[PDB]
Design an enzyme around this catalytic site. Sequence first.
Site, short mmCIF file in Angstrom:
data_model
loop_
_atom_site.label_atom_id
_atom_site.label_comp_id
_atom_site.label_asym_id
_atom_site.label_seq_id
_atom_site.Cartn_x
_atom_site.Cartn_y
_atom_site.Cartn_z
N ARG A 241 -8.46 1.93 -5.32
CA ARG A 241 -9.95 1.36 -4.52
C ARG A 241 -10.32 2.72 -3.89
NH1 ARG A 241 -8.08 -4.77 -6.73
NH2 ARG A 241 -8.94 -4.69 -8.01
N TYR A 242 -11.82 3.23 -3.46
CA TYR A 242 -12.52 3.18 -3.01
C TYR A 242 -12.42 2.92 -1.60
CZ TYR A 242 -16.73 4.58 -0.51
OH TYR A 242 -17.71 5.46 0.03
N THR A 243 -12.43 1.44 -1.59
CA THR A 243 -12.09 0.48 -0.21
C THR A 243 -10.67 0.98 0.82
OG1 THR A 243 -12.84 -1.30 -1.57
CG2 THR A 243 -11.67 -1.57 0.62
#
Lengths: 685, 685
Positions: free
Chosen positions: B82-84
């Site tokens: 995930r980008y997170t």
Amino acid sequence: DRALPFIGDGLKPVQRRIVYAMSELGLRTVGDVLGKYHPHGDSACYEAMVLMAQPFSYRYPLVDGQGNWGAPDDPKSFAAMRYTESRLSKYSELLLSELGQGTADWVPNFDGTLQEPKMLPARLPNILLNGTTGIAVGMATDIPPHNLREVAQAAIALIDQPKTTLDQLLDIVQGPDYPTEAEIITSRAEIRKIYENGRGSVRMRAVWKKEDGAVVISALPHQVSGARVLEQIAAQMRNKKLPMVDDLRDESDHENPTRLVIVPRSNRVDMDQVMNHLFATTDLEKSYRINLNMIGLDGRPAVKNLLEILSEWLVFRRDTVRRRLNYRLEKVLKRLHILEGLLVAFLNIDEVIEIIRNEDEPKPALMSRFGLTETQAEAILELKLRHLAKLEEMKIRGEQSELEKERDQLQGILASERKMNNLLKKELQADAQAYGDDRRSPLQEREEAKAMSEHDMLPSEPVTIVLSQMGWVRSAKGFKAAVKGKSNQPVVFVDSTGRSYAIDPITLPSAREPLTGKLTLPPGATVDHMLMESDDQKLLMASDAGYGFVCTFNDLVARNRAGKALITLPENAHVMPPVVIEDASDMLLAITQAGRMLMFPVSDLPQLSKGKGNKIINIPSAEAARGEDGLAQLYVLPPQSTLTIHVGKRKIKLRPEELQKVTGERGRRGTLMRGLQRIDRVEID
Amino acid sequence: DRALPFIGDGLKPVQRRIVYAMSELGLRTVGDVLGKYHPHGDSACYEAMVLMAQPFSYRYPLVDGQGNWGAPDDPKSFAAMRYTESRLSKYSELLLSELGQGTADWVPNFDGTLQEPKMLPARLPNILLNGTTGIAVGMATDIPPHNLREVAQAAIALIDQPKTTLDQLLDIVQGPDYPTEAEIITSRAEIRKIYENGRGSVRMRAVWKKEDGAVVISALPHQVSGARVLEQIAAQMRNKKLPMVDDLRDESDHENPTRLVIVPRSNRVDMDQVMNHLFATTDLEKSYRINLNMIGLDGRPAVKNLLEILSEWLVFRRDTVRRRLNYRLEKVLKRLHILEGLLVAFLNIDEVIEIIRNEDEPKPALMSRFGLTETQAEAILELKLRHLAKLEEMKIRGEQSELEKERDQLQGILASERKMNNLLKKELQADAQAYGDDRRSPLQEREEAKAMSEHDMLPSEPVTIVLSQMGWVRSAKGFKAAVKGKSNQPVVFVDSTGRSYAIDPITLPSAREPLTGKLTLPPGATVDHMLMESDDQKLLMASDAGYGFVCTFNDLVARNRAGKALITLPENAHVMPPVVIEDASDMLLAITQAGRMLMFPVSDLPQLSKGKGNKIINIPSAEAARGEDGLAQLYVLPPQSTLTIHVGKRKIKLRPEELQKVTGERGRRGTLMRGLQRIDRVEID
């Protein structure tokens, strides 16, 4: 479910929603589209949607349906159907074309998310064109579909003359026009009582033909399936009824959409009789309730007239147009108002700028002088300096000159009842030509259907009945007496005492039985005459005593073995050879044993059923008994014809001119004619 | 892969892309983010990304990594992350903060879809702070990480004085500062040769301690795993090497991140000797190549100096700032230009309107008079009349007055080399305090590691060696002769002919063997003296003939049974008791059988290895042989000390004052002293 349609657009709240939801102003599946203005999985919406997607449901469908859409009135998910598969029909343009033009009132969406039209700006009276639907029972309304062009012309006639009577409208509007080529059989006089009371019933009948031997039904009454009538005719055969029908097959294809064959037993089956039993006992002919109940412009429910319906619709169409124009007008008057204010700045710039420059709040101060409005002054304040160029002004004066031309245009129409009327006709005419179509259900009055008894279903084939001098009866096929007719109709005999008898030709043997051994006769009585005519055929019964009466053949039909006391014979009187009256206008001719003649129209001797009867020609009782005088010849014959009376080798000729001389009142002894006794024959020239 | 970093921001094209891709100006997974400026599945991007996500890779990480990110340098899909899970570090703000301010040149995206920065506006010289990575071999460059604060201060010193010498910079910049608490052991003089040539090598050593018995390693050289050194020490034990090490365990936790225990055999193992073998033969100490190769502002590759690097970076930071201000300046000058033109319309409305009204093309005509520009005139044309209000003008004069204040502000800084310098210091100072941190790798010079031979790994424990008059050797533990030392070092004896001998104390029995039955001796020769000192210990060998020489204990070590011909004895001469020289500055004292004394500094008699040696004190050959005269006493003693010479019960005292009187040139017969013969002893006060 129980809601009535609106007079304006002829739609119930559900239909309106379905149509609007699919309009341009529904701006991904089918549920997605309908779910936007309908509760999810809503039942009434579902039924109303399914209905709209099938042909033969609407006379002018609002939707082109494509697919199965759910077996019957059970489920098929609108979430399984792509938005593509449902399309609004060209006819719909009548209801939706004028929507963005100030022509409807707007009320909230089913859930308060959006807005929808209270009514639709229908250009033609869809209320009549499509009417209600389903043809169930216990509806609150029943509106038949009508032909677009008939109604259009009828609305036009009413613009030209509101005092147009119903009769004139019914010379344009024939009656209901159903999406089927089956006939409307109800009387045009009866089709009028409906349109004066807004209520009644109309009857339809399947279209058929004889295809060498059998019958082929091609068109069926509105909303009756082949399967339905084909099921009833089959129950009639399963029961010991309809015995004349041999086979029954459903030969429907796509070459022949509703082809049904009814095969009779033989060649000599009267299939018209059969067809006339079936219309009376199957749905091959059907009643349709009419109840023109609807919501008026006053928002009240009311069953109304063809006149009333068309008038009130006209006032709605007028209102709709008033709006349509005004919508443009308001939009044009505003720009002119603005253009003027701008034009005021161009001519007064030095002044307008100086006030903008020098005062606190320019706007209120700018509308003070110049006499502007809190919206013109606004437009002036929003002017960019580049807008102040010569070239820009010439654009403004131009646009203004057009918009004043247009303004007068619209205002002229809006100020004239005549100009407005020309406008509506032209639209109505164009729409009629554009969206219209020919009649489908023709009006053809037909011989009213009547059921038969288990009696007149029996064989029935040509027979000649023969009774000879010997006192024997011989029923032949296809000498003393010979009579005509079918085999199911009875044969009558009359005895020398004045009693009539009925026998069935099915009981008598062929051309290869004594009559006394068939009938119970009074002691010594001989069987004199034999008759066989239509049941309702007019007859003249009489006695050689000079008395008689008119009666129907039925009044001779006594089936019981004893007989019927028909004509009473005075002392030593004999029964006259009965006269078959073939026209109520014919003349009765009486000739006496002494040679007296009398004539009077046969519709002048009283009609009875039994008894001595009344006098025909006066002959003293005593003289009749002694066989002296008495009635010798009795004829009912066409008026103004010529006779040759045979007395041996003599042929005395009697023209209508000599017969006008024996014309008299009934009961008189009649005029004496020289040497007119023992007459051997009477022929008619 | 093979690209050098940029001097401006210290990034290779790959790193720059990874950083930019994650910046605010990357405006859904991780692949989504990097794939925007990187080819899909690109290998170099993958490695460079993984690297950035781990600690101990960068001294000032550009990203906070969270997760496994793929076992080693093999795969882990960025489409699974995930980008997170990836975030740009606070330190990054140094590189990205100034991006929207005209501070970078922009060139196309990897695929021509977007734009990206050629360089990044780094506020601090990331090139030095982070340097290169991976520490592989066959790199084109090798830049060590440095301490932010040291470098910052060093850059500041250079703004204040560009003629700052390297020596001054190396009083601020200590050297590399690695993300580890292990020591940099290389000389500060050597750490200077590196920064003058931009190339060389630096050495590191693990931090350790003695925890009663065993050794605990707590910090390890940059990028060497516990597993690695712990594997080498284990191979040394698996081999018949490192026999003194008993056990080895890895007690690393989260209480103690890099705790490694090395357990010796016993209690008397010299673990410093062990540690000093391990730094020489394991990665517990490591070399790091330095090659400051990079791309300059002239876009050429070049290995450069600490001075050169810091200077050229300064000119880049200056340029970057010039831009940053000008970016605001251009943006402010423009609004002022516009404000002026607007102000020209307010004062000349009547005139400006009249020209707008009366001429074809207003704009070209408006810039003619008034002397406006094809952009001021534009702004005037776009003016709404409402903008011409008094109140609106006061807004304009206001905004103008501020923007002229601001304009001077920026222009003043942009016109002054001094004001600009004050600005940069202040930013550098603030950034140093904001993004800085203490040193991690301290500079601690240490005793250079040396490997041992399989010889000096053997036991080694305190022993006293005893040779007695009887001619027997007895190696004891912990009367004629007693010597000191360990058990692995040899014991030397010297015979009456002038030969030295080495024996191992491991071969001799305990305190419960004849020496003749250990050594091959010349016929009749007696074993006179025994010695046992450090291998490199200085010694004085001499003969009672008056000749001798200085040599190291090693020059006496003859292991072979025959011996070594060390000192040559003239006719009837005997070997003197050898003198242990304990300081090159000490004095030599010679006393003759007749009573003559001579003294000279011991660093005045030539150093040999064998032979007769040179004269120490003159005594005629003939007289020595006959035992008449000859060298009786020989001492090397601390300078300016007092002696009591014992001659029976007599104790003749000799102070430094009487000894200054016998100080002379070597080889002289020395000064005669009264009654100084048959000396029984010499003690040192």
